[PDB]
Amino acid sequence: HWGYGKHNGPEHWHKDFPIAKGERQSPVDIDTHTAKYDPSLKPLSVSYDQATSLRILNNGHSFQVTFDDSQDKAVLKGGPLDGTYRLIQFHFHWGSLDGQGSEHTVDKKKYAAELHLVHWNTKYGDLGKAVQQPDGLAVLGIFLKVGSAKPGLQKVVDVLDSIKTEGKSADFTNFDPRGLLPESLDYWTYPGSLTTPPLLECVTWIVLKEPISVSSEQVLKFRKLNFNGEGEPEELMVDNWRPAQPLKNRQIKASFK
């Protein structure tokens, strides 16, 4: 079973998942001076008004809030995307201290954490089918830095005590993911992959330039979670991020001048 530690972490993943050394792996460093502004790109369309959250879950590598994706309800359109992508889940990656935790980096800068809102392309019918297609997923990535509290995150942190260990879940209905968004929807975009095994190269990445700020107390709660299942030696869920991968033959485009 893969993980983030010395003997099962990111440098080991290629053995069970050889795509780990593929041509479109994520995350990557975003070099702000090399990324080209592309005026053909469109405004992102984030329509989360009808979002229906279901559960919050510790899956052993992060915690995720899941959504009902049986019909168009919370979807992402526009930007670099064709067609409609339904929100299935969001999760975070974070560090043991504030100077690391994000998966993408900006001019080698590491953020305290990174939020991933995962959406799949409706023209493939289900998530399972979408992940086997180069345009099957759109993941919206948002950086977190430490400062002021993020009110829309507080309902999430208040429940983390209840899902401390792997496998634990709780009801998490009536959560509005709009409260996790920054003001500007300016973004970078590039073709990439899932950043956890099986690391499938099925993702259009859309990373927002403006981070959201969260308080030290909020991110502290992230760090109290556990990779392990109940009763096992406590091994803190921290530094669950994959480092930046080779960009290779890819261009990162900017939606803004």
Ligand SMILES: CC(=O)Nc1nnc(S(N)(=O)=O)s1
């Ligand atoms: C079903 C599903 O969402 N699988 C994922 N694997 N990696 C993801 S990430 N870290 O790139 O957002 S999402």
Ligand SMILES: [Zn+2]
């Ligand atoms: Zn992720």
